[PDB]
Amino acid sequence: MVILGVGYFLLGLILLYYGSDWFVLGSERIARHFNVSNFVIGATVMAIGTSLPEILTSAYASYMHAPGISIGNAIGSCICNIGLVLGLSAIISPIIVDKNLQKNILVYLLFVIFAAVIGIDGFSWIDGVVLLILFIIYLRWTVKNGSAKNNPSVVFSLVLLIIGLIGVLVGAELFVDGAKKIALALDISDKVIGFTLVAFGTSLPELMVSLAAAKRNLGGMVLGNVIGSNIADIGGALAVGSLFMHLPAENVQMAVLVIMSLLLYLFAKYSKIGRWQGILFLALYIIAIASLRMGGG
Numbered sequence: 001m002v003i004l005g006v007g008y009f010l011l012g013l014i015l016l017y018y019g020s021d022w023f024v025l026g027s028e029r030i031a032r033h034f035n036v037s038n039f040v041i042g043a044t045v046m047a048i049g050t051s052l053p054e055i056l057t058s059a060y061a062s063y064m065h066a067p068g069i070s071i072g073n074a075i076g077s078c079i080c081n082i083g084l085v086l087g088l089s090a091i092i093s094p095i096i097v098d099k100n101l102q103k104n105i106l107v108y109l110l111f112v113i114f115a116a117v118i119g120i121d122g123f124s125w126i127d128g129v130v131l132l133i134l135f136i137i138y139l140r141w142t143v144k145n146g147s148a149k150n151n152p153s154v155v156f157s158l159v160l161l162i163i164g165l166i167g168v169l170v171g172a173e174l175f176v177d178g179a180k181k182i183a184l185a186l187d188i189s190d191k192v193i194g195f196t197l198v199a200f201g202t203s204l205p206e207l208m209v210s211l212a213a214a215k216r217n218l219g220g221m222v223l224g225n226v227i228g229s230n231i232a233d234i235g236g237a238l239a240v241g242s243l244f245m246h247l248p249a250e251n252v253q254m255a256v257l258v259i260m261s262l263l264l265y266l267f268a269k270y271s272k273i274g275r276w277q278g279i280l281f282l283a284l285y286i287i288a289i290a291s292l293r294m295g296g297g
């Protein structure tokens with residue numbers, strides 16, 4: 001019970017570690033095959049793939065009459081993606097954002113602000129429909145502005161990507177499941193702590209994938225994965241959750257996300273996303289997890 005919890009924990013870490021690199025390699029190759037930028041492949045394929053945990057979690061939680069957990073997971077992931085994921089990544093591999101990608105980030109900021117405004121009185125299923133539709137439009141807009149029998153180079157690329165994705169998604173589950181089995185076996189299980197860590201567990205793909213891309217100096221891919229995941233977490237995870245049940249307002253967390261998203265845009269536009277910007281993101285994330293209400297909603 002405690003040993004197989006350790007077994008799942010270690011195997012999950014191994015799958016997350018190597019799986020992320022394969023997912024990054026396959027995605028980088030796919031981008032070159034389709035003549036799209038690393039940002040675009042990160043903001044679409046990689047972002048949605050790594051956000052599959054959030055979507056399922058939010059859908060399931062809301063369906064089970066826990067809409068607090070549903071939006072808690074969605075928004076908490078967004079704060080984690082900028083604060084922790086991008087924070088660590090920018091320090092590892094500083095990013096100077098090109099003028100084209102700056103417009104994408106601006107559209108991201110508008111989306112976030114829009115979601116924050118309509119969410120002041122919580123999120124209804126109609127709010128969900130609109131956000132999902134904007135999500136779809138964002139994806140098509142992003143691909144268009146980043147664009148332009150079967151080859152063994154292409155095949156091997158798709159194998160890498162898919163197996164890499166399977167690795168990080170399964171790896172994240174073994175890690176979470178393993179940790180829960182340990183805590184249960186040691187009788188230190190805490191539901192409030194567990195639900196507080198929900199967003200982090202589903203964020204393990206983004207974290208490991210972005211660090212792997214950061215190590216290979218793929219800053220466009222990193223930035224794409226962060227921006228795209230947040231949009232997927234709002235226009236997808238949050239949205240689907242609201243389809244099952246009205247989600248309660250999280251005005252403080254939305255306010256935190258808006259500030260972080262604004263900072264991200266300002267750095268991208270007028271500066272860079274490097275060491276000291278990354279330090280600030282991490283510091284704000286640390287302050288966030290130190291002061292925000294626990295229970296994950």
Ligand SMILES: CCCCCCCC/C=C\CCCCCCCC(=O)OC[C@H](O)CO
Nearest residue numbers: 107110111114126129130131133134137138
């Ligand atoms: C042009 C979109 C680009 C990508 C997003 C950038 C940020 C957009 C945020 C607000 C503007 C749009 C408000 C209208 C959104 C689309 C239509 C819609 O959702 O129609 C459903 C109807 O509003 C149910 O009452």
Ligand SMILES: CCCCCCCCCCCCCCC
Nearest residue numbers: 055136139140143235236237240
């Ligand atoms: C025309 C080029 C872009 C195609 C983009 C297809 C995007 C499909 C996105 C599906 C998202 C489903 C989210 C469910 C929560």
Ligand SMILES: CCCCCCCCCCCCCCC
Nearest residue numbers: 116117120251252254255256258
């Ligand atoms: C970033 C704006 C989020 C929505 C703010 C709406 C007006 C205030 C509503 C009461 C908010 C209490 C928490 C304030 C941070």
Ligand SMILES: CCCCCCCCCCCCCCC
Nearest residue numbers: 091092275278279280282283286
């Ligand atoms: C390549 C590494 C360069 C030096 C990186 C220093 C990182 C400092 C991170 C500080 C995070 C916030 C701490 C708040 C107390």
Ligand SMILES: [Cl-]
Nearest residue numbers: 066067068069
């Ligand atoms: Cl709840």
Ligand SMILES: [Cl-]
Nearest residue numbers: 038218219220
């Ligand atoms: Cl790149």
Ligand code: NA
Nearest residue numbers: 047050051229
């Ligand atoms: Na994601």
Ligand code: NA
Nearest residue numbers: 118121122123
């Ligand atoms: Na609303």
Ligand code: NA
Nearest residue numbers: 077199202203
């Ligand atoms: Na998450």
Ligand code: NA
Nearest residue numbers: 050051202203
């Ligand atoms: Na995720």
